Design a protein around this ligand. Structure first.
Ligand SMILES: Nc1ncnc2c1ncn2[C@@H]1O[C@H](COP(=O)(O)OP(=O)(O)OP(O)(O)=S)[C@@H](O)[C@H]1O
Ligand SMILES: Nc1ncnc2c1ncn2[C@@H]1O[C@H](COP(=O)(O)OP(=O)(O)OP(O)(O)=S)[C@@H](O)[C@H]1O
Ligand SMILES: Nc1ncnc2c1ncn2[C@@H]1O[C@H](COP(=O)(O)OP(=O)(O)OP(O)(O)=S)[C@@H](O)[C@H]1O
Ligand SMILES: Nc1ncnc2c1ncn2[C@@H]1O[C@H](COP(=O)(O)OP(=O)(O)OP(O)(O)=S)[C@@H](O)[C@H]1O
Lengths: 448, 479, 479, 448
């Protein structure tokens, strides 16, 4: 049961329905709801009133309003009067985190699982800094496997080389190209494909050994030392409170009364008072020695026109925060090295709870029609079409290509000579997402 | 655009042919009948229905919807004329046939065949069957496809009805209104059909008069509708099976959603709350005028005759169990005016459904109050929430279009040689979908001129389609 | 409340008596006539008018305004019958007299006196004089006192409509509209009056027919209106002096404000821009149907007869210069339907003034466009700026009330023994303030029943007052 | 004398100073002013008070505040008490135009020349519609000459062909490639350069015969018939009032009370009530038959995410209105065909008054470092280095290439064999704008 027809509710309502699971979304915004009703059953609803929420739940939880407070009431109304299972409710306002342990580990509020957006993006941004040279890092439902994306340039070890020409050596830890994004549109990896310049080459890597992969491909640049931020809001302060202990941080906030509290809350950080495009402040404070220029503002236009400037002065890298998640590929690449989306990360976390124990887990690498997925193979060779059969012998739908296999806690890179065993978590790249209930029907065990 | 439309057309023509079998089956199960035209039609239509959609099996997906439903009746209505042209037992002209084809399918009930009592029992089933088919047609369209288009006639309707009451599982905009409503339709036809058997009449007349009363209908296998057997039971069943069949079928959806919890769903709908009062006040005043006139010897007959005529004429049913002999001239006129307030919306229905009149009376009195309190703020009470200014406009533009067609269709019948009074008696009977002419001296539709019998066809569509559906066809903006 | 009202009433009764002198003066300057009832009435009314306001000379100041204007016609209409009751030369009954009193004062023009050609030339002046008086009455009311009330029906009438074009000052009302408008009234009556003298007819017929065309009445001193002298000039003067007198008098205020700058004021008013097209298209189509029918030997007569009948019937004038002999039955009916489109608002005119029809045609087509573009935003074009939703409501409630009265007044005439056709021919002729019955040479108001002539009076007021003015009288909210 | 340090004042203050002319800008925004003081003398100023305005003007006019009303006062204060020459003052609010003739042609208000931004952009947008297939149209100080830009694709008559291979025929009216923009960065045209795919090929054309040029290159598509707009503001209404008479217009406005007045002011237009991303409204109202989808909103983010959708459904063309002029090249090309800037058009009109009679007129084709300019050659062969000398024999600074010559009212396309006569208006393309006082010193006549 949802309570949103927004980019969260709409992206879920689109992603989750393969007839595998059934749900009902709620929203007072009719023009958006019956538009989102295409993507199931729609209960028009007013707040968390029991009529809509409570009656829909039993005999016929995700709560994504504008506000957190309304969301908490909805989980309590469903827990008090029906005792409904699960209950994931997004909570944004920081103080509900600052006392989360007191509140939530006392069981008072009924959130079974939290989705704190400010926390998820800020942890994510720190995850890119840790592996220098990584454009995007992809996370699946299984923590063990993950994709790491790099950028191919002129003079790179990976430009123009034949894919299989790199597959002849298996040095130390090994990799595999699961996806190739170029010009904004997706190229599935083939033996015949050549790595041209300015591509998003998505390498596969065991989550434990990611840095090892990038250094074997000679792409692990020097660790970042000097960082620069531009947002004083919820993400800007959280990131500073995480980086001042390990990196030389500088912040730029244009609202004094907020710039003061950032001076109080951050002991070892230098917060400023200026606009992002203040050339004097960027020159006066040594921007030609900046290694990354995270911009975390409200308006996506401001992040770009400032992160484009910092590259021009110029910084070693730049990152923006495109709030709506629909344009991440469009702004990314070229002048701006990295573009981050909270609504392609907030939804990334929601598709790991909903999809739990299911056939497919939708990765964080969803952009346009392409999306990476993780399919689960249940049943022995008698009740499954896809078990025991070697990877090269599976008649996968067009565009789909297996990149790896997760078996328990060990990541096996997909090779044509590999055997899929029972209860595997296969990681693959779909160029076209209209094929899921074909995959969802292929891996799914026949009746038991 | 036009391609996928013709796919739909030939598909329905095939479905119409499959209907042609049930008549011919009776012309061989029964011993009085002629089956060759139905089976001659079954073949020729199946071909002509198949020939159009085979090279057009290409599938593709508002301007689409208006042009479909005028074809739904234009095509099916023309096809309905074919059996009558072929069969020589009722040797009847082409226009007399197209009329009887449309009059049947449009659920009008205006006939042009004299002495149908002794006509074969095979053509007698096909006429009543076509009313049944158009009976189902209006229900699927009025409650499902038509509201989305923009002309609703369905409680609050402009284009936003989830049915309001039990608005659940509405996903399939038409695929679960055709399926679910059929059970109500069949469970209503059988109940009356066996009830007429318990009244005593033959199976044929018992059944083929249920096809006629459940749908708005009006047809008969006897020249006189229900004077064939002046028995209180048949009238008192036909009365209650017109009142029950006339109102909103989404209120008859108070039986297929968790059993019989009827009274709350019915009475809390203001349309049904006004359908009763308009029905009672009519019969009540049509009763006191009969008792004061001593038109009938015993007030049981007067009660029988009145309570049937007000509920057979104001519901657009069209059944005549009398000749208004002892009735004042002033009663057939009043009843004809009551024809405009036909059955509740979303059902086999009259020209201006109860709401159109209900909304009209509500809004007309507000305009009387504002005249004294100009600076006051007034609203409409009908539903839970007051109506959007879109719907109030969609009633008052509907009245205008109605009295725009009714006057153009009148000065079109006058020119063909009819008289002012008979034209009015005709178009008010066809625009509202009421077969009877309704005067002290009736209009008998055989006497109607050939060219008028076309204008009547043109008109009975206008009433069956919500008048706008066909009125926008000749607009420049639509094309 | 009632006290100061009776002051107004008795005050007007006195002013009406002062009018009685001018007829009797003619019955002494002429002595083909009987003047004593006018001088008997002058006295009795002056007393009965004075007796009410002397003990009520107490002065005090919307609910006030509605009850005044129903008394302005009820009282003056009753008082108008007195001369006819007294005089033995007409030999007219009471109801025939109250009818002829109201028909005259209401500017209707429906008469119940046979062979008025040879009636005295003194009673023949009083009939036309009463049309003149009710001609002036509507003007002061429609332009001034009535719009304030909230039923103005003048351009963008609703309550606030303070003089329309070149509305400067306007602080004095009724009193700065009764004085200034009189000059247009008198300067228009004389112009036609001497024009008829230049056409050739006697002073009396020249003058007493000017009181009638300008006041859009339709009376005559001859049984046949303008067939007494089938001369193109008299027709072409009566045509041009009905078109000039039918349009908005607030637009005839384009001559008393800094001289003759007419054409800009006239043509930039959408009501006059639609008065022409409706008037032309009528006569244009009423001409082509006469030429195709060879109803008249020479197309000059057909032009003469048609161009007069469309502009004497669609301006609510009610003059008959023909017998519709060679005309199709289908022409008097069409002309009768055109009676509802009466003269332009703010003028002496019939029922649904051009704007009511103009607004109705405008809004009715918008509802046809929205059916295809539901999410579009549409507006009304009539004036410079679109109309407020109050006004669009104030037309569509007026149509509803109109066809509410027109049906109750019809089933009220039917009961009294008339026939369906004659009722329609009567109420459409009286509600619209037309006069002649129309139809296939039909209604003669002498044949009408006694208790129908009362209902006709009941109706002709409803048209003369904006229908609501009297409809709210029987509301609970007003009382 | 200016009164702004904004994109107008800053772009002028940068463009106009070649030591050819001297000015003084005024602005209360210090951090922006002394930043803009780099780009001359700065008078800190409060409103139009005479101390700052009036004293600066005599013994030591352009007025670009936030508001029009303040600007009018400044021109009157300078005209009343000193009688200062010229006086160009921007006025945005429409009603000051609606009665401009009454007010301004009565001489009451002292504006010598107006710069009405809403009018200039809306006239410009109509100028692209008139020549279908034109990405951008460039206007110089001389009305006679103008550049027309096109887009080279696969299958185009101009892709891969050699430049000179097109110069062998001179059919009817002739053209010449004055500039080539590709990948956002400028390529000056050479004989060795080849026209690759997705380029901005800037053709030269006499302003009179522009359509003739594009039809001889087979690029004049069918005239536009059905247009769609998305802004209900000052530009949206003005454009509708200009197009409803010649084109089938549809408008989309999301504020009802403003959607109503647009129904009153526009007689033959269909205005709507909806959000730009309302898929239902775009599908319901036949967008697959739209020829151009102008988007004229407040937020540049909204124009893009809606004009990208209309191309996707899709429309035949799309146009946005990127308010700040600094990103016109970045958004342009690719998915969105055309991007318009008011502050690259408002400034385009100001550089035709200021530069009057001067050596250089800065074109409307300024993007990044590249800008097209028009240089005037005064003096006979005795007092000028550049007169009489054939075009191929002028040692122009690097990147500069002459494209045409305007002599009186006739446009001579530049050919290597052409002679520059006295008092010519030469049209050329600078790839790098740091060279102007080299050109400004080359064409300028030696002392007389
Ligand atoms: N009282 C309310 N009850 C229910 N939903 C509400 C209420 N008020 C606002 N909303 C929701 O407000 C949402 C639109 O705003 P938001 O979702 O907050 O914007 P957004 O969060 O940036 O978009 P998201 O994150 O993709 S849902 C819709 O889901 C509405 O249902
Ligand atoms: N142009 C700008 N340049 C620099 N900082 C800015 C600019 N605009 C806004 N900011 C900062 O960003 C803050 C906006 O933060 P809030 O809206 O309160 O929370 P938030 O930052 O929007 O939430 P998120 O996580 O950043 S989307 C402002 O209060 C300033 O601190
Ligand atoms: N009272 C004032 N006196 C002088 N300048 C003012 C005043 N108030 C605001 N400003 C000007 O406001 C400007 C910043 O806002 P705006 O220029 O209006 O924004 P903008 O117009 O979109 O940017 P432009 O068009 O490139 S100047 C600066 O030029 C300030 O000098
Ligand atoms: N998301 C949107 N979708 C569609 N129309 C919008 C949207 N946001 C704003 N608008 C419209 O654009 C208007 C903004 O206009 P104003 O700010 O009053 O003037 P303006 O349009 O900004 O001036 P210009 O010339 O367009 S920059 C709003 O009032 C709406 O009419």
């Amino acid at each position: 049961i949802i309570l949103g027809a927004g980019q969260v509710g709409g992206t879920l309502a689109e992603n989750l329905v393969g007839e595998n699971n059934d749900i009902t979304i709620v929203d007072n915004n009719a023009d958006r709801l019956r538009e989102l009703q295409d993507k199931l059953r729609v209960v028009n609803g007013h707040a968390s009133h029991p009529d809509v929420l409570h009656e829909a739940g039993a005999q016929d939880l995700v709560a994504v309003t504008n506000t957190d407070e309304t969301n908490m009431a909805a989980c309590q109304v469903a827990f008090t009067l029906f005792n409904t299972p699960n209950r994931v409710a997004r909570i944004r306002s920081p103080e509900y985190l600052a006392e989360k342990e007191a509140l939530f580990k006392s069981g008072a509020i009924p959130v079974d699982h939290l989705i704190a957006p400010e926390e998820l993006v800020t942890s994510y941004i720190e995850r890119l800094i840790q592996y220098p040279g990584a454009l995007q890092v992809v996370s699946f439902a299984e923590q063990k496997v993950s994709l790491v994306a790099v950028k191919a340039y002129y003079g790179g070890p990976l430009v123009g080389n034949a894919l299989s020409a790199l597959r002849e050596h298996m040095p130390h830890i090994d990799t595999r190209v699961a996806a190739i994004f170029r010009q904004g549109r997706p190229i599935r990896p083939q033996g015949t494909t050549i790595i041209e310049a300015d591509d998003e080459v998505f390498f596969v890597a065991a989550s434990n050994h990611i840095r090892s992969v990038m250094s074997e491909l000679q792409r692990l640049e020097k660790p970042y030392r000097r960082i620069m931020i531009v947002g004083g809001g919820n993400i800007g302060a959280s990131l500073a409170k995480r980086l001042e202990q390990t990196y030389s941080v500088k912040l730029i906030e244009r609202d004094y009364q907020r710039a003061e509290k950032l001076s109080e809350q951050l002991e070892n950080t230098i917060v400023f008072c200026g606009d992002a495009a203040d050339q004097e402040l960027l020159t006066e404070e040594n921007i030609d020695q900046v290694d990354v220029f995270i911009a975390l503002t409200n308006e996506d236009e401001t992040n770009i026109m400032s992160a484009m400037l910092a590259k021009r002065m110029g910084a070693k890298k730049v990152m923006v925060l495109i709030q709506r998640g629909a344009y991440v590929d469009l702004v990314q690449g070229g002048v701006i090295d990295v573009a981050i989306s909270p609504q392609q990360a907030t939804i990334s976390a929601l598709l790991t709870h909903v999809r739990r124990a299911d056939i497919v887990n939708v990765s964080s690498l969803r952009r346009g029609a392409a999306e990476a997925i993780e399919a689960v193979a249940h049943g022995d060779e008698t009740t499954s079409k896809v078990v025991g059969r070697a990877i090269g012998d599976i008649k996968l739908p067009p565009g789909t290509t297996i990149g790896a296999v997760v078996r328990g806690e060990e990541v096996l890179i997909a090779h044509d000579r590999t055997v899929i065993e029972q209860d595997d978590h296969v990681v693959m790249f779909l160029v076209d997402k209209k094929y899921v209930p074909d995959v969802e029907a292929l891996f799914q065990p026949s009746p038991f | 655009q036009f391609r996928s439309i013709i796919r739909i057309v030939g598909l329905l023509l095939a479905l119409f042919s499959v209907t042609m079998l049930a008549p011919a089956l009776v012309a061989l199960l029964y011993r009085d009948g002629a089956g060759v035209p139905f089976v001659t039609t079954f073949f020729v239509l199946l071909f002509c229905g198949a020939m159009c959609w085979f090279p057009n099996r290409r599938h593709k997906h508002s301007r689409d919807g208006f042009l479909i439903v005028v074809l739904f009746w234009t095509v099916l209505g023309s096809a309905g004329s074919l059996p009558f042209l072929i069969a020589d037992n009722p040797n009847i002209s082409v226009t007399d046939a197209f009329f009887e084809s449309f009059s049947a399918l449009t659920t009008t009930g205006a006939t042009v065949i004299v002495g149908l009592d002794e006509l074969p029992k095979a053509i007698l089933f096909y006429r009543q069957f076509l009313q049944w088919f158009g009976g189902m047609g209006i229900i699927v369209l009025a409650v499902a496809i038509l509201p989305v288009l923009g002309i609703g006639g369905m409680q609050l309707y402009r284009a936003e009805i989830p049915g309001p009451v039990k608005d659940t599982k509405m996903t399939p905009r038409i695929a679960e209104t055709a399926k679910a409503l059929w059970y109500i339709y069949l469970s209503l036809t059988i109940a009356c059909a066996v009830a007429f058997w318990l009244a005593g009449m033959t199976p044929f007349d018992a059944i083929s008069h249920s096809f006629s009363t459940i749908a708005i209908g009006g047809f008969s296998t006897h020249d006189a509708s229900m004077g064939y057997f002046d028995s209180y039971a048949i009238n008192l069943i036909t009365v209650v099976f017109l009142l029950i069949s006339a109102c909103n079928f989404t209120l008859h959806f108070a039986a297929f959603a968790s059993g019989g919890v009827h009274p709350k769903y019915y009475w809390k709908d203001p349309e049904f709350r006004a359908f009763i009062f308009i029905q009672v006040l009519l019969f009540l005043v049509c009763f006191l005028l009969l008792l004061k006139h001593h038109s009938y010897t015993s007030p049981y007959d007067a009660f029988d005759q009145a309570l049937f005529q007000t509920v057979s004429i104001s519901t657009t049913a069209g059944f005549t169990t009398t000749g208004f002999a002892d009735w004042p001239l002033f009663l057939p006129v009043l009843l004809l005016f009551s024809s405009f307030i036909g059955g509740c919306a979303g059902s086999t229905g009259g020209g201006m459904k109860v709401i159109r009149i209900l909304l009209l009376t509500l809004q007309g009195a507000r305009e009387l109050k504002r005249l004294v309190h100009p600076r006051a703020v007034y609203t409409i009470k009908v539903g839970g929430s007051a109506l959007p200014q879109r719907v109030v406009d969609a009633v008052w533009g509907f009245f205008s279009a109605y009295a725009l067609v009714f006057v153009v269709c009148m000065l079109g019948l006058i020119a063909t040689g009819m008289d002012e009074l008979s034209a009015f008696s005709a178009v008010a009977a066809t625009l509202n979908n009421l077969g009877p002419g309704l005067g002290e001296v009736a209009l008998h539709f055989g006497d109607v001129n050939d060219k008028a019998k076309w204008v009547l066809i043109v008109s009975m569509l206008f009433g069956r389609l919500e008048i706008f559906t066909l009125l926008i066809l000749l607009t420049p903006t639509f094309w």
